[PDB]
Amino acid sequence: WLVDLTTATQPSVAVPRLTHADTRGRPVDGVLVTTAAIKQRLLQSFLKV
Amino acid sequence: CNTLSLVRFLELGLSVACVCTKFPELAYMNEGRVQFEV
Amino acid sequence: HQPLIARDGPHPVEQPVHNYMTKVIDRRALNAAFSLATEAIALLTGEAL
Amino acid sequence: CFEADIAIPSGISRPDAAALQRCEGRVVFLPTIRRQLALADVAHESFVSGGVSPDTLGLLLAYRRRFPAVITRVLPTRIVACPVDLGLTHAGTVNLRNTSPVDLCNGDPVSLVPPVFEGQATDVRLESLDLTLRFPVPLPTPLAREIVARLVARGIRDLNPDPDLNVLYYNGARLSLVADVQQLASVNTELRSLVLNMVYSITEGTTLILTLIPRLLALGYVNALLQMQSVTREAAQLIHPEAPMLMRRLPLYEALVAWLAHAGQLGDILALAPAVRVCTFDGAAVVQSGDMAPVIRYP
């Protein structure tokens, strides 16, 4: 369910030139704002980073 | 009054793999024969 | 500059519309305020010392 | 003063922009006094109260309810109005646009309905976002109280038919109230509910008093002093009306509050109280139609 929701949209006409890293090299391409209540039961059952 | 009127694009690499052979340069041609001997 | 998969057959020819589309900027308020009592007007200026 | 901003919405045309250039100095009504406002609180479409378009009653309820604001300087992306109702008395001089009478050096002008004059005059419409700004008419206190009681009197002769009420001279001019060709047929259907209010508060009370006072004085300082200042006035009205009309206490005193409840409505409805004053300086003391006037805050 998430993985299509992860890419139902399409990438914008945008290169930031200032990227948010992942401590290795990896650039971040999404945000996924959620509520506090949903984020709890989502993380502990659908692993993790 | 703004930029970002730019997108970029190209497509190769797999564009030769599935093709899985190529003769380039067809000239003024009429008939192409390939015969099989098994 | 959208791609073209320019076709074989006598179906008529593709045509690249490299159109300029515009958008429209909104305007927002974001207002904030804070009180100040009847005293501390002579104060913070230098009157009632 | 405390100037308040009304936000211009999105894409309008240059005649819609020029419509905003023919209104610099009009009168604007608004519900709340938030320092940033939008145009959605302004339009005549924001006057819907029961799902239909308001009448001249339905406007004069709101015209006594919400708050006047006068646009000093027009702007792109904003509307600056220094509102009247804020500020101390006789301060913050503001400038208005006259309509056909004078607005003399005094008079204390009053905002009131458009359809007592030409209805599709001053109903200025925005074409792009498709809204309507029906600006009220600033009339001074004597004539404003004059014309309000004439058309509802003209509504009576238009109600159930069988002099001509419409001449009404000013100090110099002859004021043509009748804009005949298409307005007056729309007049008696846009003051339509309002005439019933001026009537029903008269038919109830007079037919209540003629079964109140005969039920009073014998059911004593108010007794003999009832007709003391009403000698040959109320007994004469008891002689005239009670003869050519018809003639119960527990529904009666129940009707006593209800009529007088409707009476307290109408006093807030009618009589058009002054809100702003013309008392200028170094003017010709006499304003003409289309010319500005320095207007000061409180009556």
Curated annotation (Swiss-Prot), chain A:
The listed locations are:
Virion; Host nucleus
Which portions of this protein are annotated as coiled-coil regions? none
Subunit field text: Homomultimer. Makes the hexons and eleven out of twelve pentons. Interacts with triplex proteins 1/TRX1 and 2/TRX2; adjacent capsomers are linked together in groups of three by triplexes, heterotrimeric complexes composed of one molecule of TRX1 and two molecules of TRX2. Interacts with scaffold protein; this interaction allows efficient MCP transport to the host nucleus. Interacts with capsid vertex component 2/CVC2. Interacts with the small capsomere-interacting protein/SCP.
**What this chain does, per the record?**
Self-assembles to form an icosahedral capsid with a T=16 symmetry, about 200 nm in diameter, and consisting of 150 hexons and 12 pentons (total of 162 capsomers). Hexons form the edges and faces of the capsid and are each composed of six MCP molecules. In contrast, one penton is found at each of the 12 vertices. Eleven of the pentons are MCP pentamers, while the last vertex is occupied by the portal complex.
What family does the Swiss-Prot or TrEMBL record give for this protein? Belongs to the herpesviridae major capsid protein family.
What protein name does the entry list? Major capsid protein
| Species assigned in the record | Human herpesvirus 2 (strain HG52) (HHV-2)
Top-level taxonomy: Viruses, Duplodnaviria, Heunggongvirae, Peploviricota, Herviviricetes
